[PDB]
Amino acid sequence: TQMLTRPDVDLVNGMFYADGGAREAYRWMRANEPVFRDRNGLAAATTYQAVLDAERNPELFSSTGGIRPDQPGMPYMIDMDDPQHLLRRKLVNAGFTRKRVMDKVDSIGRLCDTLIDAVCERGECDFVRDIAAPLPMAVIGDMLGVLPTERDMLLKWSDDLVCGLSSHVDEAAIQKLMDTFAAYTEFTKDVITKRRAEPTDDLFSVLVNSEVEGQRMSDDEIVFETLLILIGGDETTRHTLSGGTEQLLRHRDQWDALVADVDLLPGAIEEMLRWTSPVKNMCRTLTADTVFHGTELRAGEKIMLMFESANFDESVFGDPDNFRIDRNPNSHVAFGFGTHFCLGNQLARLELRLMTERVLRRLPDLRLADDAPVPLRPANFVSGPESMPVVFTPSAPVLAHH
Amino acid sequence: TQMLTRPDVDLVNGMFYADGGAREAYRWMRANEPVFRDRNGLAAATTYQAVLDAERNPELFSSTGGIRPDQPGMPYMIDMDDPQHLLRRKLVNAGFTRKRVMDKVDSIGRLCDTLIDAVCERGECDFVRDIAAPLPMAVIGDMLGVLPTERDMLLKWSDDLVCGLSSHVDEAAIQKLMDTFAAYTEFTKDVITKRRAEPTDDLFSVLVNSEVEGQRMSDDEIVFETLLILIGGDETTRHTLSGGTEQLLRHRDQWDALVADVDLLPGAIEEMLRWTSPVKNMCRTLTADTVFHGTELRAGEKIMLMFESANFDESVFGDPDNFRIDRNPNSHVAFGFGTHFCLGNQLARLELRLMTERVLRRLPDLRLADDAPVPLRPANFVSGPESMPVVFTPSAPVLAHH
Ligand SMILES: OC[C@H]1O[C@@H]2O[C@H]3[C@H](O)[C@@H](O)[C@@H](O[C@H]4[C@H](O)[C@@H](O)[C@H](O[C@H]5[C@H](O)[C@@H](O)[C@@H](O[C@H]6[C@H](O)[C@@H](O)[C@@H](O[C@H]7[C@H](O)[C@@H](O)[C@@H](O[C@H]8[C@H](O)[C@@H](O)[C@@H](O[C@H]1[C@H](O)[C@@H]2O)O[C@@H]8CO)O[C@@H]7CO)O[C@@H]6CO)O[C@@H]5CO)O[C@@H]4CO)O[C@@H]3CO
Ligand SMILES: OC[C@H]1O[C@H]2O[C@H]3[C@H](O)[C@@H](O)[C@@H](O[C@H]4[C@H](O)[C@@H](O)[C@@H](O[C@H]5[C@H](O)[C@@H](O)[C@@H](O[C@H]6[C@H](O)[C@@H](O)[C@@H](O[C@H]7[C@H](O)[C@@H](O)[C@@H](O[C@H]8[C@H](O)[C@@H](O)[C@H](O[C@H]1[C@H](O)[C@H]2O)O[C@@H]8CO)O[C@@H]7CO)O[C@@H]6CO)O[C@@H]5CO)O[C@@H]4CO)O[C@@H]3CO
Ligand code: HEM
Ligand code: HEM
Numbered sequence: 017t018q019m020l021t022r023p024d025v026d027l028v029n030g031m032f033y034a035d036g037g038a039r040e041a042y043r044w045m046r047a048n049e050p051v052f053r054d055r056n057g058l059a060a061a062t063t064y065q066a067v068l069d070a071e072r073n074p075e076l077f078s079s080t081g082g083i084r085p086d087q088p089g090m091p092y093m094i095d096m097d098d099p100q101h102l103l104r105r106k107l108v109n110a111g112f113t114r115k116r117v118m119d120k121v122d123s124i125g126r127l128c129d130t131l132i133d134a135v136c137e138r139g140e141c142d143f144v145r146d147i148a149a150p151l152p153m154a155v156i157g158d159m160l161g162v163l164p165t166e167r168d169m170l171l172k173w174s175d176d177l178v179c180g181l182s183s184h185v186d187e188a189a190i191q192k193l194m195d196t197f198a199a200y201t202e203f204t205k206d207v208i209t210k211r212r213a214e215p216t217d218d219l220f221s222v223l224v225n226s227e228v229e230g231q232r233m234s235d236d237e238i239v240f241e242t243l244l245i246l247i248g249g250d251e252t253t254r255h256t257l258s259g260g261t262e263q264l265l266r267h268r269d270q271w272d273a274l275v276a277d278v279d280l281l282p283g284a285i286e287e288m289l290r291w292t293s294p295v296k297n298m299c300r301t302l303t304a305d306t307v308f309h310g311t312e313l314r315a316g317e318k319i320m321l322m323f324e325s326a327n328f329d330e331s332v333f334g335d336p337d338n339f340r341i342d343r344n345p346n347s348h349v350a351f352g353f354g355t356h357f358c359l360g361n362q363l364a365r366l367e368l369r370l371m372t373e374r375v376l377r378r379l380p381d382l383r384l385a386d387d388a389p390v391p392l393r394p395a396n397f398v399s400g401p402e403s404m405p406v407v408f409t410p411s412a413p414v415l416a417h418h
Numbered sequence: 419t420q421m422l423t424r425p426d427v428d429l430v431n432g433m434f435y436a437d438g439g440a441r442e443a444y445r446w447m448r449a450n451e452p453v454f455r456d457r458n459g460l461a462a463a464t465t466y467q468a469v470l471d472a473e474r475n476p477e478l479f480s481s482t483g484g485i486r487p488d489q490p491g492m493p494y495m496i497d498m499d500d501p502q503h504l505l506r507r508k509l510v511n512a513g514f515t516r517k518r519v520m521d522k523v524d525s526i527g528r529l530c531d532t533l534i535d536a537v538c539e540r541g542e543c544d545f546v547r548d549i550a551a552p553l554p555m556a557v558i559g560d561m562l563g564v565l566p567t568e569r570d571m572l573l574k575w576s577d578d579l580v581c582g583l584s585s586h587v588d589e590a591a592i593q594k595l596m597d598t599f600a601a602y603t604e605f606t607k608d609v610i611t612k613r614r615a616e617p618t619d620d621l622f623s624v625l626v627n628s629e630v631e632g633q634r635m636s637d638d639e640i641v642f643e644t645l646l647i648l649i650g651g652d653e654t655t656r657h658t659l660s661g662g663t664e665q666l667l668r669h670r671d672q673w674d675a676l677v678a679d680v681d682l683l684p685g686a687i688e689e690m691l692r693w694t695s696p697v698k699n700m701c702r703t704l705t706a707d708t709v710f711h712g713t714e715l716r717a718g719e720k721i722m723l724m725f726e727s728a729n730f731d732e733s734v735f736g737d738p739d740n741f742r743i744d745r746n747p748n749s750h751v752a753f754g755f756g757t758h759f760c761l762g763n764q765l766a767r768l769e770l771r772l773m774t775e776r777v778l779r780r781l782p783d784l785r786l787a788d789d790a791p792v793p794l795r796p797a798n799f800v801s802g803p804e805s806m807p808v809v810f811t812p813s814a815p816v817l818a819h820h
Contacts, residue, residue: 019744040740337445
């Protein structure tokens with residue numbers, strides 16, 4: 017005897033996150049079955065409170081089963097629980113100190129200018145393809161100290177490892193994934209061996225030299241953690257930049273306020289993060305039977321923490337369906353919460369701030385080419401704008417390197 | 419000083435309620451300033467809790483100042499406080515017993531089929547002009563026992579008594595209003611006098627005969643209470659019918675459920691009522707200074723109870739932005755709450771159910787002619803659809819009187 021208006025959905029179907037019906041479905045779930053089971057019985061924590069409770073209780077909600085719903089865990093920190101997680105995190109954190117992040121201000125700002133220079137004379141571009149997508153990848157490659165060509169191979173390997181993991185059933189699809197993993201590891205071990213012998217100041221060198229409680233990372237460990245960073249740092253930042261900007265463009269009074277006053281921008285960045293929630297879910301595995309916010313969960317099953325749904329929880333935000341750059345407080349969970357809280361959160365905030373500040377200054381009349389909805393990427397994990405045609409009065413490039 | 423995102427609105431401007439921006443503005447109010455002051459300082463209770471608290475405390479929130487923001491009270495029951503109100507109400511209640519309402523089932527049903535008969539062969543109509551608008555006026559005229567021609571005159575007097583009250587600054591406009599009030603009173607007293615002499619079973623007869631605690635209504639009182647019913651019973655019922663049906667038409671699985679099963683219709687009517695909230699506000703006058711849900715209010719000022727805002731209060735409804743005929747419970751305040759709780763609520767529910775049942779049965783494939791938003795009537799008091807083109811497979815008229 018299900019209810020007439022119960023959403024009939026498959027939360028691992030990428031279309032659910034792209035076709036525009038997600039927020040409606042979440043409203044139904046938060047109001048009627050806050051820990052919701054989809055058409056395949058898959059459990060999902062949909063309220064902010066259920067998400068936080070699960071985040072604060074990794075003893076009961078484990079990450080070691082893997083954070084995707086139909087794959088096992090990988091050997092990197094997001095698929096580990098404390099105490100192993102904490103040590104691995106503290107090791108890798110050497111690369112993400114406040115000082116290491118803040119010292120990238122010049123280089124990231126310089127990248128931002130070159131990307132804008134590439135479109136500013138034209139008076140139109142695709143914001144995704146031409147500004148949002150290149151930026152996070154270029155920051156990563158510069159962080160790793162690699163060439164742009166190397167950066168391109170790496171970020172494509174890491175794409176293919178993502179695809180082949182989510183789909184490895186045919187014997188050819190298995191061999192292809194194993195080949196990709198071999199080529200990834202071989203390239204990355206080579207770079208590591210080089211950094212051991214002739215240190216630089218890049219992330220590889222930092223991981224090689226990191227030491228916590230007498231322990232250091234092995235080469236295999238750096239290979240996996242580097243992978244996690246290639247995967248975790250790229251598309252998410254892209255989608256906040258593009259989806260976040262999209263909302264600024266649709267709220268002209270807010271856009272104008274930000275053009276007139278750059279001190280409003282940190283608050284805007286937090287609203288962009290909440291609104292876009294690029295990571296749609298992370299899984300946890302039940303370590304015991306428990307009744308959780310009304311739903312009986314069994315040991316061994318996975319539950320999806322639905323961060324977008326949490327970030328639109330009216331019981332916490334009051335008016336989450338209104339986009340507001342002045343929202344304060346804004347305790348959104350776009351980066352999760354708790355021991356796994358996004359390691360790259362400060363760097364992501366920096367990239368968003370440095371690029372948006374320059375978008376505001378250099379393209380001050382920016383608008384959507386047309387007000388229709390922006391297409392989103394059908395994906396069940398990280399999703400945001402596929403393309404976003406924009407227009408602006410052209411201006412002359414800065415061409416900093418001359 | 420004010421927040422960037424604070425709505426800049428005039429709650430007595432009818433365009434606020436028709437241009438589609440109201441629900442967004444209410445979201446901001448409920449979240450940020452539950453007793454909100456508009457751009458002219460006019461106070462408004464926007465949360466369900468603030469509306470219920472005001473309704474339950476008429477000692478502090480009086481109706482005797484008038485229930486409109488810019489007019490004094492009239493001598494009929496909605497502008498009275500208890501004990502005067504209770505007595506007047508109980509007298510008039512003789513016309514609205516369960517028995518009197520239920521004994522209208524055949525006549526209202528017959529009316530409904532006559533209205534559908536006028537469009538069924540054509541395959542299209544304007545649902546406001548041709549179905550929603552005629553019905554509540556015809557029920558009222560039948561209730562009073564008058565001829566259709568008289569009913570038409572009464573309902574036009576009542577309209578422009580409403581218009582002239584709202585605007586009567588200059589001498590010419592004061593004169594038109596006094597002229598209509600005299601013409602209205604003359605006609606109604608004449609009918610009353612006839613009914614005293616030669617009783618029928620209509621509402622005038624029932625009011626003449628009503629006796630509560632040894633007291634009876636005078637002719638002048640029946641004149642005023644009849645005026646209140648002519649105003650109160652007409653456009654409100656229209657807007658729930660047309661706006662309610664509009665939502666059923668836009669949710670095809672719900673429409674299809676109702677066509678298959680008429681037992682879902684009482685729940686549907688309650689959701690139609692909540693969603694459409696045709697009475698957008700009623701005023702109260704403060705009888706003392708008080709700090710109310712955060713806002714300092716002064717004795718003698720008026721506050722608007724924003725019923726639609728209360729009916730979209732997420733803290734109470736969970737998912738009010740999803741239209742759901744299965745919503746249960748559904749304690750909406752479309753009829754208000756408390757001692758003034760709509761006297762016509764059961765007749766209105768009856769008209770809505772009898773007409774909707776016939777629409778479902780006789781026009782089972784009904785649809786909006788196109789999906790664009792339906793124009794709403796700019797008015798600061800009672801508002802809903804101005805027109806609603808619909809289409810359906812034609813059928814043969816019933817032609818009951820043959
Ligand atoms: O229902 C109509 C018939 O009711 C007659 O008796 C009414 C009584 O009049 C009602 O008000 C009700 O209680 C009264 C209460 O006695 C009175 O204090 C109160 O307050 C009003 C105040 O007294 C007025 O001064 C008013 O301001 C008006 C102003 O004073 C005046 O100059 C007016 O212009 C009037 C005009 O002067 C007058 O001629 C009127 O025409 C009316 C007829 O003359 C009149 O006889 C009446 O019919 C009543 C029967 O005769 C019952 O005995 O209605 C005629 C119109 O149909 O024209 C203008 C008014 O039409 O301008 C000011 C307003 O125009 O201020 C207070 C109101 O704002 O009034 C209450 C009622 O509100 O007792 C009976 C029951 O209804
Ligand atoms: O899923 C784990 C599970 O794997 C099962 O299925 C695999 C099969 O085992 C494997 O052969 C695969 O095909 C691989 C091939 O045969 C390998 O030769 C490989 O080439 C390897 C090279 O052979 C190795 O040198 C290897 O280097 C690794 C290094 O020595 C070591 O430090 C390691 O780092 C990981 C740890 O070693 C390790 O503990 C690991 O945890 C694993 C456990 O040790 C396993 O017992 C557990 O069971 C195995 C089954 O026995 C096996 O049949 O699986 C655990 C999962 O991790 O994680 C550590 C992370 O730091 O790994 C170093 C490399 O980074 O790697 C090279 C890469 O070319 O090529 C194939 C894999 O690409 O066949 C099936 C699947 O088809
Ligand atoms: C807007 C951009 C980003 C978003 C929305 C985002 C979001 C998240 C989320 C939701 C988690 C899981 C936290 C949890 O389950 O509670 C996570 C973890 C993680 N992220 Fe990010 N991320 C972003 C950018 C980045 C960047 C730039 C990097 C690195 C360069 C990065 C690296 C990591 C790593 C290493 C983890 C694992 C931390 C752990 O398990 O302790 N992320 N992120
Ligand atoms: C959908 C149809 C209707 C709606 C939405 C509606 C709404 C309301 C509202 C909101 C109030 C004020 C309650 C308050 O302030 O707390 C009210 C009062 C009143 N209504 Fe209705 N109404 C409707 C239909 C009718 C009908 C058919 C009649 C019969 C003519 C009627 C007669 C009255 C009367 C006489 C009052 C004053 C009762 C009092 O002050 O005690 N209404 N209505």
